[PDB]
């Protein structure tokens, strides 16, 4: 299972473009091998010191150079060389690992921004970004563990087994092979038993994080309804589950490490018994026994390093499948192949044909819908609340596809049109208008990020917000706060209208753009919007509950129960005495 | 500096309540000392094996029991005992560490929920929860490092210095003291040089995380204005800064580890030179030399463990000051001492007296404001957009304090009244109404979490939303999505009205509660709200831009430029021919 994830992740070890990080990888591998070779030499120099001081105890000599000085310096310099080269390849491979981090994070964020609207509506705000940054931390930790601690250790077992089989009998090879067999059997058994606790801890951690994020987003809601203790209790219960699972994780890791060190230390005892038997039989010397012990002990050091941090490693593994499964989710809003960009031969003629749509398959909202928005005219869509008139503005934008029927913009099915050209041809003021946690000028220029300050000021006049922004102390640098909450709702809505004005699209969709404005302000703003639409011959589609802003619309579409019940102008709908008349007579 | 943070954190080692986690701490410390003692015995048993196999090479014997069997088993069993007791105290102290994690996280979340509104408006959504969970990870990692790797290592230097000074000369004590001096000097110098890179990496990581979170919150904004590439580029630049700083961090950690291992291995070489000189002079034996080397090497193992994970440790330290500084921020909205709960002798008579307020000190918004909301009457506050009429509803709630003047609810200054009683006496429908990412029924029952299903259904009828919820497939279990975006805005607003209805407060504040509703729906909802207010004699304060919902209000307050320009009823404001007349004649 996880072998597939490791195979997919291995492409970041071997990039095919830069060729300089390839040189860094090769240099890190060469320093890895050199460090392991020096680390395996240092027991040989210790054996040489032991033997030269043991056999030369009878003759009188000095330790400066006569007996053991050169090999003392050799031992010290080889220890220094081993550790220095290990840290040097750590420093070298750090750059490759961090470049892989930035590339993975940017790619995954870019895939997130192209996912469907339904996924982003049904997710949790904290969960996605937690998956992103925790997955990047996982990539970094797992790459650094595999290159820094796992491969060097496996190479250490390789050379230790080879040297103990070469310089000594096959008995040591048999002992170490049985040790690796028992070690692997114990490790896989206890890992198959440790997986439940570690996935439960991750699930409870995610639950606690989502509780905290959802409580902090709705801080005004928790203070308005005095549910601070309720949110604290919810967070506390989630953390109770998390600490129970984490205690089980740690308690079962201290069984893994304990048992695998039982196996390793029993191996060390048996090998030292074989060495003692060899020493007493005259085959081996004291230095050979200390060589055996030192080799196996220097093998122990990386092994209990891996045992100590196994929690973080395998945590990064389940972070691997959660982030990669986030990358593997498909998009249901896909461009048809060989798709031409959207063209507007005449004005933005929008035509719905037999459109049937429901976010849930058992509840159709638009039911056999068929409406024709004329080209270049101001068109108003009215109706009861929840009737499905702001679901036009997100299904015409192709955030959702109809189950039946087709949508045409100038006789072009929007399914057979590139998403990029369609979404640049449509500008919409959303019903709720959250702003980025930045200044006023940045939020205004978000409509066209490469627009100059004069265009931003012009869109500020056209949205009837500029004089207020001048009257403020910070001017256009006034911070709007989190989700545009440090300014008033009417000013925030006018900023959204300013974004639409600065974008200047052929198709304009206003989803109650004057809902939070007083009568004078909405009157002036509607005057500016109407003269913009009439001057540029834009196809403007106004979804509005305030009928007094759209009584001069060219076409008024009354939408009830997801079907057009009546169309026509204001006066025609008055002599129809229909649903629009009942809406208007109720003032 | 950081010593103060460690002192403050040390209270979680010594809890004063449970006394059972105190027993766990003592058991972990006892197993710590026992494991270190056994780990220091195992070189002594290796020395004994070496000596018994060296001096007894002349006489013929077997290794089973005659020469070295008992001490081979002693060596192996002591190694097993050391590692087993180390992992056992890790398992024991894990529970104490995790309980400290849950307590710290719950306390810090609770302090966050009681902070000021201004702090929550001016913060970043990702940043606070990232600080919380990353600080909890820091608490866990730093406690486990200090009890698991730092104190055991310091105890190891203690016993290694003591044993080498006891069994051998003062020369080894002088060498090891000079080694500790050089080690500490190098470590503090390179740590003072490493702090810049590690704080820059944390700052860039926070910047990248905030960019990602702000982009994902505004997914509809980035798709509506086609700024996916812009957000990807912003995230990529932040990640560029992060990877540059992380590469510098790792490159400077591989200098710390390299140099401190230079110092340690030079110490080991010098001590083995002294041991060789002692062996050649007849004072020492071969086993004593291997004892020296084994003691110092088993000291090396924890030291390069700390060197390998020093990044994570000191990262947890700067997480310590960021989370603790989050806990040290004060609240400016504080209850007066000896504060009595809010009483309502007559109805909810609200009176503003000379109130002067501005979120920025250089821009007053309410300027010498003086209005008197009568008791038990429906009162409407109208005015231009941005005039400061929804800043009444958050300054009467005491989310902000006035700079000058006082606010009275039944002749009780709300500054001299407990926040809990004041905020339970006030229920408000906010201007924007985000919902929790849960079902419809949970969002409705958030008004009173301990209310039964019949009361939830009753508030659903009174908010004119129930029949729609029945018509849905999932009923009251319909998920509303992130921030209530998987339902329509009118239905979301009616759910907020339902929360206010279920809360049933004495004071009702509606901040444009019918802004996203059609004329029939707002007419029916206003009928239900008006009969609720009249039946229970509630003091209802309606902030509304739709004047047709509040033409029957008992008092209409016209608020322009932050001062009451005119009051009175609808008819009186008509014969005044003032600002309200100009609002109404503009229809
Ligand atoms: N995923 C979804 N996204 C949007 N609406 C959904 C979804 N699932 C179910 N619905 C329901 O489908 C209906 C679609 O109506 P729509 O959202 O267009 O109303 P609206 O025109 O926005 O009304 P208003 O503008 O007054 O809020 C809503 O009542 C909503 O409750
Ligand atoms: N942190 C802040 N939160 C809210 N408003 C702020 C803040 N800082 C400054 N302001 C300004 O203070 C004024 C307060 O007015 P308020 O937000 O009550 O207007 P409003 O009643 O919401 O008008 P509308 O309902 O038409 O948007 C606003 O004009 C706003 O620009
Ligand atoms: Mg709508
Ligand atoms: Mg308002």
Residue numbers in the entry:
A (entry chain A), B (entry chain B): 92 to 678
What wording appears in the published article?
Then, the cluster in the sample was replaced with GSSG, which permitted us to determine a structure at an average resolution of 2.8 Å, CtAtm1occl. In contrast to previous forms, this sample demonstrates well-defined NBDs in which two ATP molecules are readily identified in the cryo-EM density in proximity to Y450, K480, S481, and Q603. As anticipated, this structure is alike the equivalent state of ScAtm1 and AtAtm3 (RMSD 1.6 and 1.4 Å). Indeed, surface analysis reveals the TM-domain to remain inaccessible from the intermembrane space of mitochondria, but now also from the matrix side. Yet, TM6 remains kinked in the structure, in contrast to occluded states of NaAtm1. In this light, we conclude the structure likely represents an early fully occluded state, triggered by the supplementation of cargo and/or nucleotide. The overall location of the CtAtm1occl pocket across the matrix-membrane interface between TM2, TM3 and TM 6 has essentially not been altered vis-à-vis the matrix-exposed cavity present in the inward-facing conformations, and the highly electropositive surface charge is also maintained. However, interestingly, in the cargo-binding region next to F396, the pocket is divided by residue pairs Y232, V400, and E403 aligning directly each side of the pocket with the two pathways separated by the TM6 linking pairs that are present in our other CtAtm1 structures. Continued passage through the TM-domain is however restricted by the now enlarged inner gate, consisting of H240, F396, and S399.
Previous studies suggest mitochondrial ABCB7-type exporters are involved in maturation of cytosolic iron-sulfur proteins. Here, we report a series of cryo-electron microscopy structures of a eukaryotic homolog of human ABCB7, CtAtm1, determined at average resolutions ranging from 2.8 to 3.2 Å, complemented by functional characterization and molecular docking in silico. We propose that CtAtm1 accepts delivery from glutathione-complexed iron-sulfur clusters.
